[PDB]
Amino acid sequence: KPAVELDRHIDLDQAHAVASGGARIVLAPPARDRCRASEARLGAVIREARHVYGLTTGFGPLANRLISGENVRTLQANLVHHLASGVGPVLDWTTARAMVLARLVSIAQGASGASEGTIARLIDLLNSELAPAVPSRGTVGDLTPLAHMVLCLQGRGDFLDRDGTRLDGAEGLRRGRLQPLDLSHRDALALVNGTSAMTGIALVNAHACRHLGNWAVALTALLAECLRGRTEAWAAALSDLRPHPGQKDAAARLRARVDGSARVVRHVIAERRLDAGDIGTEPEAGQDAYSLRCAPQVLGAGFDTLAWHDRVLTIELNAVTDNPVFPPDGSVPALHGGNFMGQHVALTSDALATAVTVLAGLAERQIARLTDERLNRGLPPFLHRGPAGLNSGFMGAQVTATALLAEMRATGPASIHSISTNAANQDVVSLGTIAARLCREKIDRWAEILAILALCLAQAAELRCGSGLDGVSPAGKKLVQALREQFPPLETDRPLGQEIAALATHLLQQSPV
Amino acid sequence: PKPAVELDRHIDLDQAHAVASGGARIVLAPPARDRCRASEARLGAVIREARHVYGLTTGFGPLANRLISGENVRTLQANLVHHLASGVGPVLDWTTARAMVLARLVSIAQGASGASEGTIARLIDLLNSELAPAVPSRGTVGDLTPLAHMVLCLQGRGDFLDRDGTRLDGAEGLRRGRLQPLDLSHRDALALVNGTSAMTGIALVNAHACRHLGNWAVALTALLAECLRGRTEAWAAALSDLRPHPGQKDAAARLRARVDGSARVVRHVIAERRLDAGDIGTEPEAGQDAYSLRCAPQVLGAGFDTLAWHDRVLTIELNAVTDNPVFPPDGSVPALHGGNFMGQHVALTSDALATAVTVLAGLAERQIARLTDERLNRGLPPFLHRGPAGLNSGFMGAQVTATALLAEMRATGPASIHSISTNAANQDVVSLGTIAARLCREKIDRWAEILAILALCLAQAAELRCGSGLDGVSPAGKKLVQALREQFPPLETDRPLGQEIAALATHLLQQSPV
Amino acid sequence: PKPAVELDRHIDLDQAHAVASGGARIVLAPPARDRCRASEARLGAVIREARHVYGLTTGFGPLANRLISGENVRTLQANLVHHLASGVGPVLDWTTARAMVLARLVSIAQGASGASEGTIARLIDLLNSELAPAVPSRGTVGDLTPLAHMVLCLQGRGDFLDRDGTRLDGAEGLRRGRLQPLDLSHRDALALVNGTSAMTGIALVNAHACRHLGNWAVALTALLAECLRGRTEAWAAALSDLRPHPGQKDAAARLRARVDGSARVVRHVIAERRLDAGDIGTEPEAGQDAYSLRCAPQVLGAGFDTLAWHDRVLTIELNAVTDNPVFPPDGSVPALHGGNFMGQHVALTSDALATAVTVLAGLAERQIARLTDERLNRGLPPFLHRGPAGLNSGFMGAQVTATALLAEMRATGPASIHSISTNAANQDVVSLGTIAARLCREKIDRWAEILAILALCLAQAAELRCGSGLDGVSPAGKKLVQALREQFPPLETDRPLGQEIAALATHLLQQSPV
Ligand SMILES: O=C(O)/C=C/c1ccc(O)cc1
Ligand SMILES: O=C(O)/C=C/c1ccc(O)cc1
């Protein structure tokens, strides 16, 4: 199993690898040294009785109640207690671990004061096959979910195995070989702080979107091979005229997908010189409908949105979103501010959510065109096999895709719903965790719509080019053959619900390569 | 000596707005003029050779399978403008309409549209005049309809707008502005009715307005701290470094600068204080401010980063060729057919910026709600009234009005998610970018009104807290209040504020506090 | 001989619109005049007895804890109107502003507001004039602000509007309308600045508009069936009886009536046909129409039931007393303090109606989308063009415009869910009913434009299918097309349709196809 050495910076791929259990995690010596130095600084702050939130004060508006050193253990224990008011389905295994990792990366910068033991508890969890069982709702953007995490790590909360099966606190510590979290150093705020939950949810969203984006491209390409699509619309020259990075990338990836294909139309229409005799109505127009012709532009805009989201998220993931914080340079004993305000993830998650809904709509319209006997240039209605009428093929699945898209559209941005709370102390809140969660739901819906499109295209390719897929590009052939290893052709109507669900799960974790 | 913007290949957003607003004249650089002349020649050849090209030898949309004889091209393109002129709704404002014209011009200047010298000159003339075409704001799915209306205007068959929004009939417009009627005899109509000009023009005006409102958001947040004994340590650079989002670092830096020299803010780092047994108890105030002050860098910062992304994308779009079909300058092929007119980029960025604006307007609204609350404003009069309490309510009405404006902003969401297959299913996916840009503009206008209310409240609060002399107020804060007081008197007794709010809002959208 | 509406206690929605639109004068019935005179006296007694009453012996909002001495009440109420005049945004249109005035009047007529005879006369005089107060549309969280602006107008300190929307200053309004300046010396200002008058006025105008648009939605659906050989069995009464929703039953019955006498629709019940062995195979067409025709009763019906609910609630609101405080006519107590001003009823019904309007607008848009599609319109020209195809595109632009208008409608959601605590947390929950009603109105306007496009398309389609003589077309269908053709010529060749769409839309909102 590969290992990710965490020093100061970790990229999104490395983060997902650790969160997903694909890689172990190790704290590099430099990071351990910085953290040990921060641990010492917290010790000094405490010995000096400096006025520091959480060390000598109550919480929120109650910070005006100063606390004596002898009562800090109780203080921080009750912090975790009152914050554990979360409700709703627990975060999935990968996401909960991504949250744990997000808190760890912040701590690794060396300004949180976390003790070596506390850090070890986070590392141990990530190297185990377990995840804390944390409720998904309750935060306005992430004290509540992190408090639940703390309780779990103390053996006072459930754990999740890779399959999602729940284990009680005691069993989790035993099975994962985890030691109970001990906060005797008064470093509880190093664990209950920042934007860890929304950041964890967001990095999982990022990974899923990369794979779905690859599928969106690969299916658009296969669509072209099933409907005699025109490749000139995907020409590099057009990209150069409207140089959006995401568009250029999309167009390039589309051209690569259909390289070697004999099923697409490559002629440049303007090369044709017309004669008087040609004047009249031709069978087909010289350009395709937008679901093919404008794929670079639509996909590209979505890709540029994801690029922005990922740039912002990379900074957030590697930042210290803690409050208070302890300056490594020792300029002041501690700083008090609001780096826990998750507005960055809130806004990027909302923007990505819109992009996902837009790209899902493209896929949905691609299915709608491919299955329409009036628009699919000669293919069977709904790509059925067997006697028509007696069989409807993908007619149900097509409507299901529309249903999934319509549902996605009903939910909008989470960020615009800030409500003054906490006795007006938190008079503005980010709702970033909700934003990231709403984006995740759309991503899941998009995966299902793409799954339906994938199943439709495997059938359409065979109906158009025969089981041998004559004229189909090497990439298209590889994709269909891969699908057919687990999903049989539709020779007669059958229930597709379970296959759609199974395929969607795959699309979210792997690309067509 | 009005400034001049020489257009060649690239033009930045500030230059673009200078031309659209009439602050600068525009000229086509010699290299651009030559590239355009070369493209003009290519179109001529394409037509002479009877090449199969959309709009030159074919119908439009799904009717493109209907080929057209060269003898009827004049009619073909004339009816294109005719059938597309189905727009409705209020006309785009003067600056925005001109921004659309500019956006089409910049695309043409790249030299791949085949536009004739006369056509280009007609666009430049409009931009150098004091006029703007009167074009309906609704009708496009993202921008043939508004552009077709523009064409009719430039032909004297449509109204024009003066800087005030007053309409002039076509003939009067060409006359007053010394504009020659647009002549499409060269069959270059597709150079004018194409691309994402409308949404791009609307968005470039949005970008400019947001820069100014962002500056007011920072300046007012700073003045708020001076009126509520705000703590500056939350805006420390060290915190920005720990969470290095560019927008946040900038917001914090600008906030610190605004209060530089102030004796009204609390600058002590609370952690420097060493506590002893006698300190253990309940203090009057907590050691940190409520989020509307403490988290300003993070909230404003996220908004600024969204605007930064919006502008990066918009800059590329403005300087791109969103035409279809296009005529490659290298001459590799007679023409290319694709979909560079799909405005998904402006659609998604406008929607993202709209959300950011709603979030920042919410911050300003909560700042007003805190400042005017006698239980939260640390000693200031309820609703900052003057005169006997009760008999006077001060800004009580204005405060509720700010909330009402914010609530309305929240009712409208992203435009992009509503794509609907249309044009006989040929345009099965559409961007709705023009709608997206327009919805963002509306929120920007509401944000300006909310900031205007906050500004008027702060001018009053500063005097109530520090005396008419503003003792202890920062140099920047003093200058801002003094400037406001030049046109907006103190509220000594209750009076209608509606007109003043609207007047100030107009100002905030065009100038920053300096 | 201008009709007259005599107000006593109850007025229906039609009478209300008749007065608001100036189609009828308004007179106060003898019993209403007496109830009001008695209430006026009760207000006098409350003041004489120094009863603890909001607005008479107290400040406003959270400032009500500040008690006021009788000698300062004139000033108290004057500043109330002053601080509340913080409205911004475009003014309410002539009819809607008058509807607001009427709403306040009807509440007062119940005799629990204490309004003096003069105050009542000022409202009546305004309604019987050709003017309306010029009132900003934004500023209320749900309607003190718009009503305060109304008060200023009636005192000659605010603008007025003529039927065309042209603005007149305060002096000119009082002069031209032959109105007396409003005098609040009786300390009855709270009888004018109170309740839900603005949202109720906006909503009642919405109700009238929806009735007409609904009639057009039915008429055009029927004409669509005559243009596409629609099957009438889907509109049979038997189906309505099996699923007894009132709105659906009514929709089906109105549809059948519209096509009565038509020889262009298919009336054969498919199940009557017995199939033989040689019938098995693929028929040209399916035995049932697409949903835009087959499910018209169900879709239109659900919208009609929503409007019915909206109207039932609105009727109660219009004829209710939404004031605070109130003076019990039964003399049980001097006054009651509560929250009848909370416009949650109009907020929720406006939001529900807005959704229904968007759904029905969607139906019309899809009907246009089907009718103009050569692959779906059963033999009609692509986009219903005349003249050579390609060279002409007909309604291709208008069809896209319809889609764009619908997409914009969808971007805005319910206003009610955005309640934000305001007024120093005193108004911790607000209705936003005024905003809700306004958002619904905008959707209604978009719906009218979409229906206008459909109407123009259908007139053309009817002539293309049945010839200029409309052979086989029902009497109702013929009347509608002929009526349209008196003002809107056929589209024999492509031409700008924007102005015609807008003109027709204006007509559809005020008159039904009869
Ligand atoms: O203002 C802060 O830094 C603290 C906020 C807070 C709000 C609710 C809690 O349950 C804990 C902390
Ligand atoms: O597919 C295209 O390139 C053309 C689309 C189009 C749609 C509606 C119009 O009115 C004109 C062009």
Ligand SMILES: O=C(O)/C=C/c1ccc(O)cc1
């Ligand atoms: O609570 C009330 O009845 C008064 C509310 C109110 C709020 C804002 C105003 O400007 C006037 C009255």
